[PDB]
């Protein structure tokens, strides 16, 4: 129901009461609905009810008070009787002010005090040890007034955050409840069908199965609320305590450093020993103002919340369901999961691991080379959003439909496949409903970022290769789509570098997306043209950005030898650097450039900054390689703050910074 | 290589080779005018045009105004020798500022390359000189002599500011049609502008000032310039291609004239309102006419005029027009450097892109309206820069695009009266009732185009052949390519200024006729059942005047008085500004005022229902009766239950045909052909899905992206106008008082204005996030399914028809049958995506994030940085830098200032008085990393002492030290003072912030709490809502004044001031941007070294410190305890930092000499025992999860595993250190682990586990305290 008058008044004790105004309306509208006779309307049901359930309490609002910017969580007026007067929570919420919340808001005393007045034996005593005395009395007063703070926070705990925590604890139990009563509803309406339907007993089978991992998943939503309204009310609370018992304290010290500063103040005019300089001196020295009892600190009041407790239950419901780690020790190597879930990996103990982006990547045969996750969400359901990326580094060519990772049980799940140059991703449901989309350009022996977001709140499915929004689809025509606890890594008849594999059971943005790439990619390493570790002593081929498909060639000319692209032998390039113990290149290191002639030859720059092909050892120059962390591998190299750009049309490379910035840029394959 | 040779000046003597006077083709007959040549074949005539075209004789206005919304009329303008000198400068000024551009040094090459062709000769086998192209400069002797030209810049027409294109066609072709070309003259006047509003780049620059920006006249320049390149090409679109409006609707304009020519220049999304078969008409018949041209050149035998060789005009004309020669000289058309030539015409030389390269503020769309007229000057260089315009470097001006301002830099633009004077061309709306009516300009309407300009051969089916090629994608411009352009362009070939035969004395030539334009109606009058955002943001207007006017929500109440304004606004804020305020209160309540502004503006309303639409905002509602209703709940609540619909005036047309099958050419025992033939097949229908998709997203960008664009100007005019209201609301309040009040109050409207300004700059940028994803979603939604339905059907329609088509060559191909089936059944079963960032380059988020951290280092009114080898300014002022001689800077990072208590150490930052803080209400940010000492003496105690002050006659902001604390400090002109302070306790064991680096953050919201920041987290906020006007130091200073302790310094680096008042989450990426991720850290904050001891500490247990059991191979390392302490008594109590053995980091991989640790650095770590050395070593065959770790003689170390992997993460200053050995094995990170009693060092592969970090994890944390003197500790 919605009103608590009603639902008292209602002498039959039939309804209930509740706050979940869209699931309400939505029970509302299918009022006159037909019966739902077969597992597809069931489907369609449970999933709106879910949707319904999960918008109506894990929803908040963000407002600004005279504290900051809060979470303000609306349903807690219609949860507690919290200023139900207004039209909302949230405007009575900002007329009235944090210290609305609660009943007794007048509480803070002034503790008793007392202050030890200097001392008359002080009178007698030299200048230095007068000083010194003095000097003790204002470092035990700064300690008495820390102490008083102290005892003020202790006061606003005790009084004003009992309250509220109070506030805190019923609108969990009010959560729970409401979460109870959307449970009843569900399997009363499940056992419904399973008793007076003619569906097929595999489908209620099947039906009972999803409707366990649906219950999960509102216990889910259900936490999550859970976590708002904890993190509202504490922000409420400290946000009291910074209008309500601050000032209270600040005033009380006011009046408390002015009386000992007329005390201090009077004690030194009326001490004999000292000139009257050295009075104004000790006067003006031993002050109190406002610098000495500004104890405020908000990260303290926000930290007294942090425990081991909230610690273990973060790392416990932590979304990464699975994310694989691998190594190599001596003797073997090492893979699993590092999520800290119950999922089990069967791997085929001929998987090779080879460094990857930045760490180990799985080196699969295609052919005989099979992993097996097992965890009990990888069945998924009819309302569990999800999230799968990991970097795919492609070393095939065929054609043929190949099926590289996914969960399918009989033909319901969802995959993904090699096919053409590029990947298919699928998802068949029970009901026979198919998303199938095809993804170009994956598949060329480089690395890419793969991230697929299915969110089944917004039923909304994100795929981005790399970086870039590659599909935003629908899924609202998708519905149970459970499949067997298994996801099977086997990536048919294409070997291929698989790393960082890694499932949530959270959708996953397009920031998120952006900052994992950067983060992963900006570990201090050059990257070549294909996403791989540039490294030292390797023949590359050098190629700038603006001009990726012309690559450079070696021409003699002016008894000297110079490099140059045409609008002609390619010239080979290679890095060396001063230490041989250096095997890969890093960001911001001196290298050498060496071509391989029939004897090789190293980089220089000439007067007019263009680049001489040398023979000496010792007189080429070290240059320095950087790059932009925005772009994964189109490196840099400088030499004395001036980079090498390409010249002018008569094409060779020119150390000049009068051009534009994308002939600096540069790249290596 | 100036554009212009020599300085020109209009009083210089003629002399017959580049000043002299000309005479040009006319009706009749014209005395000869005196002209200058600027460039090969470029002419200028600093004249009016009154003999180009006999019809527009008469400077006087004609009868008629233009059908164009800004215009402007004067007779006087350019009549005198001083004023025509002004124009020939203005003209060569904007010359040589579009060549100083690589883009523009493109077009002026080929507008120079690009000759007229010779057709004036009815003998096919000669070439003759039109006579119409060429222009008679009379030789100082008396004689005069015949000259061929390109272009030749004339001043404007009766209408100043109407710069266009003509030129004289021949006898009866089309010159700028048919590839020949013909002389341009463009009546371009460089001393006026337009004034325009534009809104899309407070995302980038969210301090944009009020009023009107001004073009760029380099801009209009290039505009006019590339048309008439395009001219010159004859590649000119028919000016009978109009884009057709739609006007019968109220709600649609009275009319508009744009030519595809036009939209084709414009470029961005302006060139993508043609379709892609329309543009390929073009291309192929601008190729036909091409190929035409070389057959003319083929049967070619000798030339008529001139006694230029036959080969040199062979290859004058193949330069121009890039013709192909083969050993028999013929000349053919290359389909592919045609390609390359139109793209580099049509799709290159855009406006755009222009306005790309010259980083200025220009109207992106044509439909967006210029306002105002504008007069300028350009050729003085303290108003007007060839690289800058009127954005001048290093000044105010540069920042902010404020240069072309006309609120702001107003001493550069001179307001002029518009003759399209207000309701000329215009549409009535009336509510029927009284029925009330309102005025609404011609342009101020919405546009809607008509569908025949949306034209595609997608119902027309295909026929597949096996040799069948694939056509490349239509990739968008970018500078990219341009560059690429730019590097294989070919700018030395220059065209031969030969000798022709001379002309007549007086050349006969007529103008091309252009398509007479019927001028859309006028005065037309509507009625309708409702109000509309016409009538609500009529509602909005008031008038100038001294009556009182009150702000009402009634919209029709405000309609029927002038002296009532309707606002969206809650009844709080009418019933704020409604009352009668008494001059007690008054800055109380315009600062009230002010709260309730900046609040309601910028309210959102978040949601997640709906899937890709992420915020609201509810007051769009009641702002312009957008959809319909009133509340703006309701108006919530119908946009979650429909979408982007509601939005839009009207619902597009979209019309998407049956896609044309595709039949397949049968080919008889030829697997080869077969297998060719279905994946041409397949690859053709991506490219069908290519097409469909570009031509829904053409069709959004015409028929819904415009006005969800028209709906954000009007909610910034509505922004605009609230603020306007309000404003002269508070002006009356202000007035009612005496004289002897108003100075009471330092009231300055100045102010008011900029924070107004500035509130509804943040109000406009959540408007237009809000508009575009609702446009966004509106595509994806609405749009896109179609045609993903229409692809569905031609798939399943293909995959029968191949299916069929393999069955019937069961012959042919034996055994591959399956695989073909299978192939197509996979391909065609599957989606193609509808990524729009390929089509739209507007949607990027690479190009978010760059801007969001351009946005946080870049709007810093001051960027202090050490480079070279000077500390300077890097922002957009270069404000001046004093640096007194006892500033020490860091050898190991130059970066970091070190101020001492002395007089002759201190930093003055000389500001540009224009960005001295002297303002009642703005916002102000300022950052920076401060690293202070351990206080040892108790003189310490209560003395504070300020360190960076910018305080003047007891007022301004200054952050202060104190004995454990630091003080931000506020003091108006009032002289009350609001200070905010972060105290850290010096009587702790380990502490986070006593000689640590620190990054001090404080953001002053003046209607909010000033706000300290430390190291990222918010540390203390105090009230600063009362303070009045902070006068600021006009001088920022950088010492150490009032320390009485002889030995204290600070250390302090990175000092940014912002204008805007930094969020949390913008504090927090500016502390993990500027901690140099890349770069490991010590204790302390400074960059991790090599061959500099370190002292080690556990995060996990601090009380424990590290040492060796003993030193050899049995040995191990552990951890002991405790720490100790070192005290002073009621000053200092700490855990001793000194204490245990010591570690050196040595290179093992570093392959430069810069004793700097950076990330993944692979490295030998040695232990200092008893001052000798040891190798950090250890065994890799012991078992165990956890293997012990050793001291090792370094001679003694051998094979045993020692590499040592540097790790820095983001944080407490910690190192993790991984421990490899040769092979590249993870044989772990090191940390501790416990054996009996013993904590014993050991290296393990269980933390590298874990990943979840924080608790339990963070044993693994070590940190590296090197022995600084901020400590002082004795050893």
């Not at chain 1, 056992?191 to 409707?211: E, F």
């Not at chain 1, 073997?332 to 930045?358: F, P, R």
């Not at chain 1, 981005?464 to 459970?482: C, G, H, M, Q, R």
């Not at chain 2, 080969?311 to 290359?334: A, H, R």
Request: hydrophobic share 35%; proline share 3%; with cysteine.
């Amino acid at each position: 129901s919605s009103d608590f008058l009603k639902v008292i008044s209602s002498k039959d004790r039939s309804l209930v009461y509740s706050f979940l105004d869209n699931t309400i309306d939505y029970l509302d509208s299918i009022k006159y609905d037909g019966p739902i006779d077969t597992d597809k309307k069931y489907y369609l049901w449970l999933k709106e009810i879910f949707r319904n359930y999960s918008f109506d309490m894990t929803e908040t609002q963000e407002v600004n008070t005279l504290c900051g910017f809060n979470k303000v969580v609306p349903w807690l007026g219609k949860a507690l009787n919290i200023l139900n007067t207004g039209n909302s929570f949230i405007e009575e919420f900002k007329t009235l002010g944090p210290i609305s919340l609660i009943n007794k808001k007048e509480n803070i005393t002034m503790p008793k005090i007392e202050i030890d007045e200097i001392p008359n034996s002080m009178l007698n005593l030299s200048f230095k040890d007068l000083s010194e005395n003095l000097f003790n009395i204002f470092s035990k007063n700064n300690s008495y007034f820390e102490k008083i703070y102290y005892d003020f926070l202790d006061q606003w705990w005790t009084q004003y955050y009992s309250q509220y925590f109070d506030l805190i604890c019923m609108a969990k139990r009010s959560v729970l409840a409401q979460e109870s009563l959307i449970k009843k509803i569900i399997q009363k309406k499940l056992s419904y069908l399973i008793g007076n339907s003619n569906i097929s007993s595999d489908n209620l089978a099947l039906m009972n199965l999803t409707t366990t991992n649906t219950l999960r998943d509102i216990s889910n939503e259900s936490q999550i609320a859970m976590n708002n309204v904890n993190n509202f009310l504490n922000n409420v609370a400290i946000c009291v305590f910074q209008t309500n018992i601050y000032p209270k304290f600040i005033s009380f010290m006011e009046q408390c450093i002015n009386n000992i500063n007329k005390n201090t103040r009077e004690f030194i005019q009326k001490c004999t020993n000292i000139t009257e300089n050295e009075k104004l001196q000790l006067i003006n020295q031993n002050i109190f103002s406002s610098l000495d009892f500004d104890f405020l600190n908000i990260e303290n009041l926000k930290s007294l919340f942090n425990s081991e407790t909230g610690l273990l239950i973060k790392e416990e419901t932590s979304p990464y369901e699975l994310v694989l780690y691998a190594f190599q020790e001596p003797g073997n190597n090492a893979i699993g999961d590092a999520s800290g879930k119950n999922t089990s990996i069967e791997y085929s103990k001929d998987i090779g691991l080879v460094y990857g982006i930045n760490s180990d990547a799985l080196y699969l045969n295609g052919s005989n080379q099979s992993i097996s996750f097992s965890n009990d969400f990888f069945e998924n359901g009819l309302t569990n959003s999800f999230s799968i990326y990991f970097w795919l580094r492609n070393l095939g060519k065929d054609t043929i439909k190949s099926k590289l990772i996914g969960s399918k049980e009989d033909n319901c799940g969802w995959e993904i496949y090699f096919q053409d140059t590029g990947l298919v991703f699928n998802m068949i449901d029970s009901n026979g409903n198919e998303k199938n989309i095809y993804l170009s350009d994956v598949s060329n022996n480089s690395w890419h970022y793969i991230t697929i977001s299915v969110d089944r709140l917004k039923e909304q499915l994100l795929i981005f290769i790399d970086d870039n929004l590659v599909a935003n689809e629908s899924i609202k025509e998708i519905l149970n789509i459970y499949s067997s606890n298994i996801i099977s890594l086997l990536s048919e008849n294409n070997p291929s570098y698989i790393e960082g594999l890694t499932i949530l059971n959270k959708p996953t943005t397009s920031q998120e997306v952006l900052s994992n790439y950067f983060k992963v990619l900006n570990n201090s390493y050059i990257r070549d043209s294909s996403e791989e570790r540039l490294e030292y002593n390797k023949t590359y081929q050098l190629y700038n950005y603006v001009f990726s498909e012309n690559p450079i060639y070696e021409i003699k000319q002016n008894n000297n030898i110079y490099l140059t692209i045409n609008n002609l032998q390619v010239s080979k390039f290679k890095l060396l650097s001063i230490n041989p113990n250096k095997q890969y290149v890093q960001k911001l290191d001196e290298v050498i450039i060496s071509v391989l002639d029939n004897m090789e030859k190293y980089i220089d720059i000439s007067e007019d900054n263009r680049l001489q092909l040398i023979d000496n050892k010792n007189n080429a120059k070290k240059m320095i390689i950087s790059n932009d962390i925005f772009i994964s591998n189109c490196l840099t190299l400088s030499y004395n703050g001036k980079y090498i750009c390409l010249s002018m049309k008569d094409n060779w490379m020119i150390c000049n910074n009068d051009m534009s910035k994308y002939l600096y840029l540069w790249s290596f394959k | 290589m100036p554009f212009v040779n020599k300085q020109f000046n209009y009083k210089d003597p003629v002399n017959g080779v580049d000043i002299a006077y000309i005479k040009i083709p006319n009706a009749g007959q014209m005395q000869p005018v005196k002209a200058f040549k600027i460039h090969n074949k470029i002419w200028v005539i600093p004249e009016r045009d009154t003999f180009t075209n006999p019809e527009e004789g008469d400077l006087n206005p004609p009868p008629e105004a233009k059908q164009v919304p800004v215009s402007y009329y004067d007779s006087t303008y350019l009549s005198t020798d001083n004023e025509k000198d002004n124009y020939l400068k203005g003209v060569t000024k904007l010359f040589e500022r579009i060549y100083s551009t690589d883009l523009g040094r493109m077009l002026l090459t080929s507008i120079v390359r690009g000759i007229p062709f010779w057709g004036g000769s009815t003998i096919d086998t000669e070439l003759k000189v039109i006579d119409t192209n060429c222009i008679n400069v009379i030789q100082p002797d008396g004689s005069y002599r015949s000259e061929e030209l390109n272009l030749v810049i004339i001043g404007p027409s009766a209408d100043i500011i109407q710069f266009e294109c003509k030129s004289f066609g021949h006898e009866v072709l089309n010159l700028t049609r048919n590839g020949y070309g013909s002389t341009q003259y463009i009546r371009f006047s460089p001393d006026f502008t337009f004034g325009f509003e534009e809104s899309l780049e407070v995302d980038t620059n969210p301090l944009l000032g009020a009023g009107k920006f001004a073009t760029d006249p380099a801009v209009t320049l290039a505009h006019q310039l590339i048309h008439a390149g395009h001219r010159l090409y004859g590649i000119a679109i028919n000016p009978n291609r109009v884009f057709k409006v739609n006007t019968n609707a109220y709600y649609e304009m009275s009319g508009l004239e744009v030519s595809f020519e036009e939209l084709r220049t414009f470029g961005g999304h302006d060139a993508k309102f043609i379709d892609s078969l329309q543009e390929n008409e073009f291309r192929l018949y601008y190729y036909n006419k091409f190929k035409d041209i070389a057959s003319t050149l083929n049967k070619a035998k000798s030339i008529v005029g001139t006694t230029a060789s036959l080969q040199y005009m062979k290859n004058v004309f193949k330069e121009k027009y890039l013709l192909s020669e083969d050993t028999s000289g013929k000349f053919s058309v290359d389909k592919l450097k045609f390609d390359k030539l139109y793209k580099m015409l049509t799709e290159i030389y855009t406006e755009d892109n222009f306005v790309k390269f010259f980083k200025v503020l220009n109207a992106k769309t044509f439909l967006n309206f210029d306002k105002a007229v504008f007069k300028i000057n350009i050729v003085p260089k303290v108003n007007y820069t060839i690289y800058d315009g009127f954005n001048l470097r290093n000044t105010n001006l540069a920042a902010n695009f404020n240069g072309q301002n006309t609120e702001i830099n107003n001493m550069n633009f001179t307001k002029l009266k518009n003759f399209t004077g207000l309701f000329e061309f215009y549409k009535l709306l009336c509510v029927r009732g009284n029925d009330l009516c309102i005025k609404v300009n011609n342009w101020d309407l919405f546009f809607s185009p008509s569908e025949d300009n949306f034209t595609n051969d997608l119902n027309k089916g295909e026929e597949i052949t096996s040799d069948t090629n694939i056509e490349a994608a239509e990739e968008n411009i970018s500078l990219d390519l341009i560059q690429q352009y730019y590097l294989t362009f070919n700018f030395d070939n220059e065209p031969e200024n030969i000798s022709i035969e001379n002309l007549s004395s007086d050349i006969i030539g007529q103008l091309e006729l252009m398509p007479n334009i019927e001028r859309f109606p006028n005065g037309k009058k509507y009625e309708l059942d409702k109000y509309t955002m016409f009538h609500y943001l009529r509602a909005q207007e008031f008038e100038h005047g001294k009556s009182r006017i009150a702000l009402t929500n009634s919209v029709n109440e405000a309609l029927l008085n002038p002296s009532r304004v309707y606002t969206f606004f809650s009844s709080d804020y009418v019933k704020k500004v409604n009352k009668a305020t008494e001059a007690a209160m008054f800055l109380g309540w315009v600062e009230q005022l002010v709260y309730d502004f900046t609040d309601e503006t910028s309210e959102v309303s978040t949601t997640d229902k709906i899937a890709d639409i992420t915020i609201i905002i509810p007051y769009i509602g009641p702002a312009l009766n957008i959809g319909n209703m009133l509340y703006k709940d309701d108006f919530v609540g119908a946009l979650i239950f429909s979408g982007a619909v509601i939005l839009l005036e009207f619902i597009p047309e979209i019309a998407i045909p049956v896609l044309g099958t595709f039949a397949l050419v049968s080919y008889i025992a030829n697997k080869v052909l077969t297998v060719q033939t279905i994946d041409n097949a397949l690859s053709k229908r991506n490219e069908k899905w290519d097409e469909v998709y570009k031509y829904i997203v053409t069709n959004w960008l015409a028929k819904v992206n415009t006005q969800i664009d028209l709906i954000r100007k009007k909610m910034k005019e509505a922004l605009e106008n609230q603020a306007e209201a309000t404003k002269a609301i508070i002006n009356y309040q202000y007035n009612q008082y005496t004289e002897e009040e108003k100075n009471n109050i330092n009231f300055n409207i100045d102010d008011l204005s900029s924070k107004l300004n500035e509130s509804i700059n943040k109000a406009m940028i959540n408007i237009n996030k809000f508009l575009n994803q609702c446009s966004v979603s509106y595509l994806m939604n609405s749009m896109i399914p179609y045609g993903v339905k229409r692809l569905e059907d031609f798939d399943a329609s293909l995959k029968d028809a191949l299916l069929k088509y393999i069955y019937d060559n069961r012959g042919t191909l034996i055994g591959q049958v399956d695989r073909l089936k299978d192939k197509v059944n996979n391909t065609l079963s599957t989606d193609i995506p509808f990524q729009l960032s390929k089509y739209v380059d507007n949607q990027r988020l690479l190009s978010t994030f760059t801007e969001y951290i351009k946005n946080i280092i870049n709007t810093s009114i001051l960027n202090l940085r050490y480079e070279s080898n000077h500390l300077i300014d890097l922002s957009r002022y270069a404000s001046k830098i004093n640096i007194g001689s006892k500033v020490n800077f860091d050898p190991i990072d130059k970066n970091q200032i070190q101020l001492f208590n002395l007089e002759s150490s201190k930093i003055e930052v000389i500001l540009k008085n224009a960005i001295v803080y002297n303002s009642m209400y703005e916002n102000f940010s300022t950052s920076f990393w401060i690293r202070i000492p351990k206080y040892f003496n108790s003189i310490s105690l209560n003395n504070e002492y300020t360190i960076i002050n910018c305080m003047e006659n007891n007022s301004g902001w200054k952050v202060s030290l104190n004995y454990g604390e630091i003080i931000w400090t506020l003091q108006d002109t009032q002289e009350i003072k609001q200070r905010v302070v972060f105290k850290y306790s010096q009587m702790i064991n380990i502490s986070d912030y006593i000689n640590r680096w620190i990054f001090v953050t404080i953001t002053n919201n003046r209607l909010n709490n000033s706000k300290i920041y430390i190291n990222g987290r918010l540390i203390d906020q105090k009230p600063i809502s009362n303070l009045g006007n902070i006068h600021a130091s006009n001088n920022i200073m950088f010492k150490l004044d009032g320390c009485r302790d002889t030995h204290r310094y600070i250390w302090i680096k990175y000092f940014n001031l912002f204008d805007k008042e930094l969020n949390e989450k913008e504090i927090k990426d500016l502390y993990d941007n500027q901690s140099n991720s890349g770069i490991l850290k010590d204790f302390w904050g400074d960059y991790l070294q090599y061959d500099k001891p370190y002292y080690m500490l556990n995060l996990y247990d601090p009380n424990k410190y590290v040492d060796v059991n003993n030193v050899g191979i049995r040995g191990y390392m552990y951890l002991k305890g405790p720490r100790g302490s070192v005290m002073t008594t009621n000053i200092y109590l700490n855990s001793s930092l000194y204490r245990g053995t010591k570690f050196i980091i040595k290179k093992y991989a570093s392959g430069n000499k810069d004793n700097i640790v950076r990330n993944n650095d692979r490295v030998y770590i040695n232990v200092v025992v008893k001052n000798k050395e040891y190798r950090l070593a250890t065994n890799a065959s012991q078992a165990g999860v956890e293997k012990i770790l050793s001291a090792l003689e370094i001679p003694d170390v051998g094979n045993l595993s020692q590499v040592v992997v540097m790790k820095s993460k983001n944080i407490t200053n910690k190192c993790k250190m991984n421990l490899q050995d040769n092979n590249g094995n993870d044989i772990g990170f090191i940390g501790f682990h416990q054996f009996n009693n013993i904590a014993k060092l050991v290296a393990s592969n269980w933390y590298n586990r874990q990943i979840e970090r924080s608790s339990r994890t963070l044993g693994c944390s070590w940190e590296f305290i090197p022995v600084d003197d901020g400590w002082g500790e004795r050893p």
